[PDB]
Amino acid sequence: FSENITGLHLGKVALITGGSAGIGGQVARLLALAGGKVMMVARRESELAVARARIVSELEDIGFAGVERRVQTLANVDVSNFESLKGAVDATLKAFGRIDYLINNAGVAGAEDMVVDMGVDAWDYTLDANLVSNYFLMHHVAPLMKAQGSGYILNVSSYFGGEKYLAVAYPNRADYAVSKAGQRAMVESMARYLGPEVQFNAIAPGPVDGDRLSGTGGKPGLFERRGKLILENKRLNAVHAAAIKAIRRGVRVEAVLARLARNDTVKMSHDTNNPRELRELALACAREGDGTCTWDQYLLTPQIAAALVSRLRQAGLFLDAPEWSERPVTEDGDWLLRVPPEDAPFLPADKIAAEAKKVGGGVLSKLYLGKMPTEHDVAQATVFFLADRAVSGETFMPSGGLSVERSTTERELFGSPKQERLDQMRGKTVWIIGEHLVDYLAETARAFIEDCHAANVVLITRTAEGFDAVEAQLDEDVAQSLTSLVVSSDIEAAMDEALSQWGRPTTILSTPFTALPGKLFEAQDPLTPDEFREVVADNLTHHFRVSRRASLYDDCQLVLTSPDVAMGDKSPAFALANFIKTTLHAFTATLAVENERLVHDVPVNQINLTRRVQSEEPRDLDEHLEEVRRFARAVLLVGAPLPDAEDSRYRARIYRGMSMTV
């Protein structure tokens, strides 16, 4: 095979990110074997040098001439840094005088935390490395490709990013799932604008057989890694659930934490002045041991203990707690009166191996072709797809026929719920977060106050002016139930301040503060990579930042809103809104599954303000007012306290993680 494809890519120049190892290294190798000139770029100098040297050795043996000039490298390329990526484009052009193929392969695993535990810096890094980087390179290379009359851009996405019209939950990996869904969503929404010259496609492999998956050197394989995190998250969730259940029954949070601080299951199981929830928790923990590990004798490690107090803090459960209300966040790891010894594992390796075999079997059982593709299999597929000249705007699936069955699909709304369900809102508080979507914010505030008899709508805005514009659209009597909170630092601070001032919300509606830009690849005024990074911040990170607090609130429903497009607009804003709708659905689907595992059980649903077909967008005032009314009906449908999940397995499922277009 490897010596008999010299004709497939002869003279084509490729820039490949993450080109030192895995799929990227194999794609670099096979493009070179196929006659291509390759600039391989990566962070690690040594891996990259060894990889390129093996490729050049093979090119000699199949009798290419001039083999050193055919495969070039650039190390210390950090895809989270714009200046570093620009160096990769400059190096490709200096070496080869053009770029034919851009292969957006570099990727990080990301935070590997539940949304409620995930830092904003970790989230931002994942989105910067995995998604914004791809747009940065597209911005710089697409004009070069258009000017020469041809090019190909390929995004290396993941099965876990979902597929067109079908989102997929990836619990513990929301940052990763969003970044991968985004790489595909770019292909779906932007390929129109890269044509006619540039083909723009994705690949979406699932798990891939090689050193990284198997584990090499000292390193756990990926299923063993996932399994160990599953158990850590299970212990955190269990300790947290017991603490919350005790606090709901009216045990003081300081009493719960003083009792957890003793960190001794034996003593907690039977000591009668531990609340029932902590006794039940300690008994259950005491049955999970193997005779070597310590998690059967200690409830918590410092790391799980720190994550626990962060969850209690962010739910506002320390507001009235004298000590905990002012303790420095820096000390969240230091409050246990005893810690597991460092000479023994916390977790049992048998339970880790069983979690890993369940992950592994769960994938293997879903493959039509019965075995996971290798890195070489996926790279081979990639190099074959790169030779086609008729495909654009598609995602290829070199996964082994990976088939995860789910019904998390974009729905157009036409329907409603009972007046008895809406009447449960009477006297309650709701939060609406927004700025520019004044008609939608106003009609929703009106529906909650006038139709559902909510006592208080807290309108959280970027500016006083944004508040005034919505208030001006309400009747004076309805406006007396609207409260203003203007963001002064960040949205999480504003949500903490709303919770502190006016209490626990029943419904949180999250809308973007800013309208989408009306540009993308236009030579006169293109969307710059900094402006695209802002689009991601305003339309994806914003909802993550609201979600990570809202998911900690008992009896609250969370509603996320994707962007609108101004009536009569004919710009790429419509493409950008569909890009966000797809990418946010990965978030909504994943968070709906994580939240069902948390004691707070917060439902999350998405409402879309842009339709899939631009000609079906509202085209006159009657249609605009119809959509504004439909939007508020959709918010009530997923925002009002939900009917019984025990009622119906089918209906239970429809109200978690839906994406509904109005």
Next chain:
Amino acid sequence: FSENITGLHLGKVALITGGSAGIGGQVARLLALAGGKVMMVARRESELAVARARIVSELEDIGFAGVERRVQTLANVDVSNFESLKGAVDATLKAFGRIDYLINNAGVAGAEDMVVDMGVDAWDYTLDANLVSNYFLMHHVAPLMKAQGSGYILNVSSYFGGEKYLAVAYPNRADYAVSKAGQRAMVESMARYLGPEVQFNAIAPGPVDGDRLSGTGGKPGLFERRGKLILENKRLNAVHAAAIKAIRRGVRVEAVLARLARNDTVKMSHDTNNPRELRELALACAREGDGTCTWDQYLLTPQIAAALVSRLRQAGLFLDAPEWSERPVTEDGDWLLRVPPEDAPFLPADKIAAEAKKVGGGVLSKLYLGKMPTEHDVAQATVFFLADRAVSGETFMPSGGLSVERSTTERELFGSPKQERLDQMRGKTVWIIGEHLVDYLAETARAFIEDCHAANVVLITRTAEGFDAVEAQLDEDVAQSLTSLVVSSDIEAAMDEALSQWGRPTTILSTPFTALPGKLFEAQDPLTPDEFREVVADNLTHHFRVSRRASLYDDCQLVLTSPDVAMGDKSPAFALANFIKTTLHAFTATLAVENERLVHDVPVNQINLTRRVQSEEPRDLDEHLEEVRRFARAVLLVGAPLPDAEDSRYRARIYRGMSMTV
């Protein structure tokens, strides 16, 4: 080096149907150049010999040895002759000892008629040639491939068969669209059962640049072909619309036909004897001429006049017409008093050219890559895709980035219409067609009689026993409003009989008479091609046969039902149900568009009795009863008179061509 890509297919054996010309011929050529062995099969020896000789010549040139034995042919192989397809499998095994790739390429354009004008024989010819032929070959080759441990089946579908979760209307081509959608739906629902050994994928090109599209000899190009059919259908629809509107005002059908038979635009324009609808039609036709063509002087050719009277007959409009009732169907083309002269064209060559430019321009404007792909471009893409080993269950799109925007996605139902809209059913007649789905037919009859106050539900069944079973589930008071009609010849005659006896229906619900088989590729007891053909007859043709009459009924709503799967079943019935759901959605989408062009304006919607995810199927009695009640609410949602397009453009679109799963 330049053109060596043997590593791709060296030694791989392909059987290609329609392998002498177009894409098929270019796939044969490019597989051979990539080191593959090919059996090219087609009807004409002369064409096969030219194609084979050209390939063998190019192989000699680029330096292959033993080239004669690498490219073989078999003539008289026609996808409408299944015995000849089996011979092509035998020939491939005799020549090469094995088969690696089956390329299901051959196909026909089909009837090129609106559903209301299409014969059952023409429909069956298309589905047998384009879809059942592919299953026939899969049935024979899959066991060979499974036994050798590897293989690839590739169905050559069409963009106009749709894509996963998104149906596309293809008006005047419903037979073709269904066949192409079926090729894809087999890939989506059956790849699981061809794995792990066999990869099963499709390609879905749109229009392809070559001799067939351009046209050769004096043979019109495809766009010119389509343009002339558009004019002939426009004339038939306009004459039909005027006749129906005159009949709705109370002009006797006899009188309308006697005026049309004069077939003189200038006379019909001005004469006061003629109803206003015929005057307006005559005036409009008179303004359409070019000074050469005759369609401005004559309303009708014999062919269009035959199609017109067939539409009136099938609507029951001759029931009280003494002459026309009894006229033999043989004489439908003989009733005009004057016919256009043979020496001059009926249609204007210039308006055909304009419709052809409009069709062509429409396609071109939707191509991301700006240029229609050539046969060579599509064949090259196919040969690259066939080298991949990690993809199964997917449709590749080597179309030039063809993107037809539509919102025809499968939707899971949750919502309701106002009681006021259900109340318009009071006193009306509903037809329910079915046999095996007793619980669903019973709840639906009860919902129409008890909840909507329908006067009469005509239950059209295969047997008296099937009627008795539904009647047994109803309260005696409800059953008083249920009428039996047992099919004695065909469903179209049962519909004519029900219309004649009990009058025009407001709602027609079409359910299949037979349950799906519980088998597919199992070595012990596979689904035979003949049994697969009966699945197609029972679950696709059955609905076509109902639809071709229902679509001619004023103020009637049509509802098509896709198959259920018995609770607790674990067979391939579930795969067959999802295959039908996808394939019937192509019919539902296309018929919804055609029917809006007809004067009768009959809405059509689809309801699915099987979910996409097998774990989400009803598991117990409570879930079964919940689904039965939800099915009847879905039938009412799309079966009761819809609210005006004028009331809401968005709502009007939802309620036409939908696929709703309960």
